């Protein structure tokens, strides 16, 4: 009765240096291929999928963009299950970097957990910070000196000489793309090479880190899911952006303290070379209560729409179930509305929150009046001056003013011009 038995859940929590990708994953897959089990492997990012492809060199595996092993991203798995026909089951599921609080990652591990509890598959979660109780300063075979210092929260001129006098390469974690922009401006002004990694740039620019060896990588939490930045120092203000639903709108004002699992992953970027002691420089405390974030509602929206009313009630993975904001099934859509939802998610780059509000409520898929018929206060500032305006296909001038306002559609990685392409009926 081993790890590939239907209903077994294994958590592999090993640190860097224990052979996870190059020794442990290829052995897990060899056993699955030997036992002729249909096997699913989930990577968080295409970057990690490329590493797996190298580690699984010379095995019979299908990588998504004869084989009984399928390797794909967390998000690809969820987006496939939103299709009527995308619902074949695997007998063994292995999820890498399974701590990610991206909504698709939460719903993926919730779904696989639900199947494993109904004895439909075996589940392996691989993460150094399994969901549940975390420690901020885990001991490993890595050497890390952790020290608390005041850290700039934006541009600085004088002081903080320890930042620029350090010899060797740094990863600086920032709460948002905007804050990262500020830090990168000052670092470049002071003669340092900088690469910015975030939701928008990670998949394209991660490879530049190995190639260019910049003095600083200025990174959002995107780097907490398997990024090997080859740095000797982490700078960590221990903050993140706080997307939350307030008065029926998604807001992006100010910040929250990172979870302990997040602080541990940020610290976890260093300590990778046996024999070398690295630095983790931090400011302030962690906060484990992230239950107020819109990510839990978004993950329930996805999980509700990749399970059936007939199939028994789905849950988030073990301890995350306390953070499911409504009774399971609450956000389930009709086939017809789920087709609209999936289109907005996959073709229009909508957030789950906004794709759900639109698909659930709008009179028809080809209506765009919801983008200008909202309350006055839902307008968007235009960089060039005034409020954002566009022309409908009928040629009428509109002021962008959506019925459902999600601030994430207008900054933090997304351009207003892509949303105006939707609203103007060009997408």
What would your notes on this structure say?
It is classed as viral protein, hydrolase. There is one protein chain. With 427 residues, this protein is of the alpha/beta class. The protein has 12 helices and 18 strands. Helix content is 30%, strand content 17%. It has a 6-stranded parallel beta sheet with strand order 1-6-5-2-4-3, sandwiched between helices. Among the domains are: 9-126, 3-Layer(aba) Sandwich (Rossmann fold), CATH 3.40.50.300; 143-282, Rossmann fold (3-Layer(aba) Sandwich), CATH 3.40.50.300.
Biggest sheet details = 6 strands, parallel
Into which percentage range does the β-strand content fall? Answer: 15-25%
Look at the helices and sheets and give the structural class.
Answer: alpha/beta
CATH domain fold name of the domain at 143-282: Rossmann fold
What would CATH call the architecture of the domain at 143-282? 3-Layer(aba) Sandwich
Q: Taking strands numbered 1, 2, ... along the chain, how are they ordered across the largest sheet?
A: 1-6-5-2-4-3
How many angstroms does the end-to-end distance come to?
52 Å
In short:
30% of the residues lie in helices and 17% in strands. With 427 residues, the chain is α/β, with parallel strands linked by helices. Strand 17 (389-391) and strand 18 (397-399) form a beta hairpin.
């Amino acid at each position: 009765h081993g790890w590939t038995s239907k209903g077994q859940i294994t958590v592999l929590d090993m640190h860097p240096g224990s052979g996870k990708t190059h020794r442990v994953l290829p052995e897990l897959i060899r056993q699955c291929i030997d036992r002729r089990l249909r096997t699913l492997v989930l990577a968080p990012t295409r970057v990690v999928l490329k590493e797996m492809e190298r580690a699984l060199n010379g095995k019979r595996v299908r990588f998504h963009s004869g084989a009984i092993v399928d390797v794909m991203c967390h998000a690809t798995y969820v987006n496939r299950r939103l299709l009527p026909q995308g619902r074949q089951n695997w007998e063994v599921a292995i999820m890498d970097e399974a701590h990610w609080t991206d909504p698709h990652s939460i719903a993926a591990r919730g779904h696989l957990y639900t199947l494993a509890k109904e004895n439909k598959c075996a589940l392996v979660l691989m993460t150094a910070t399994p969901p549940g109780k975390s420690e901020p300063f885990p001991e490993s075979n890595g050497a890390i000196t952790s020290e608390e210092r005041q850290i700039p929260n934006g541009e600085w001129r004088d002081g903080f000489d320890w930042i620029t006098e350090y010899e060797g390469r740094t990863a600086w974690f920032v709460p948002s793309i905007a804050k990262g922009g500020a830090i990168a401006r000052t670092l470049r002004q002071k003669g340092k090479s900088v690469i910015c990694l975030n939701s928008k740039t990670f998949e394209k620019d991660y490879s530049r880190v190995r190639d260019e060896k910049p003095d600083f990588v200025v990174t959002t939490d995107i780097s907490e899911m398997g990024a090997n930045l080859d740095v000797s120092r982490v700078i960590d203000g221990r903050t993140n952006i706080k997307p939350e639903e307030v008065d029926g709108k998604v807001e992006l004002t100010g910040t929250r303290r990172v979870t302990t699992a997040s602080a541990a992953q940020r610290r976890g970027r260093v300590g990778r070379q046996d024999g070398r002691t690295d630095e983790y420089i931090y400011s302030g405390q962690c906060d484990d209560d992230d239950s107020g974030l819109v990510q839990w509602k978004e993950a329930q929206i996805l999980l509700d729409n990749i399970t059936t009313l007939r199939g028994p009630v789905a849950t988030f993975y073990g301890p995350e179930q306390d953070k499911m904001p409504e009774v399971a099934g609450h956000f389930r859509l009709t086939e017809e509305k789920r087709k609209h939802f999936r289109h907005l998610l996959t073709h229009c780059d909508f957030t789950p929150w906004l794709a759900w509000h639109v698909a659930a409520n709008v009179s028809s898929v080809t209506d765009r009046s919801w983008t200008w018929e909202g309350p006055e206060a839902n307008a968007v500032d235009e960089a060039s001056g005034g409020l954002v305006t566009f022309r409908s296909p009928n040629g009428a001038e509109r002021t962008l003013r959506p019925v459902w306002k999600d601030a994430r559609m207008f900054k933090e990685g997304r351009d207003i011009k892509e949303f105006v392409a939707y609203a103007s009926g060009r997408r």
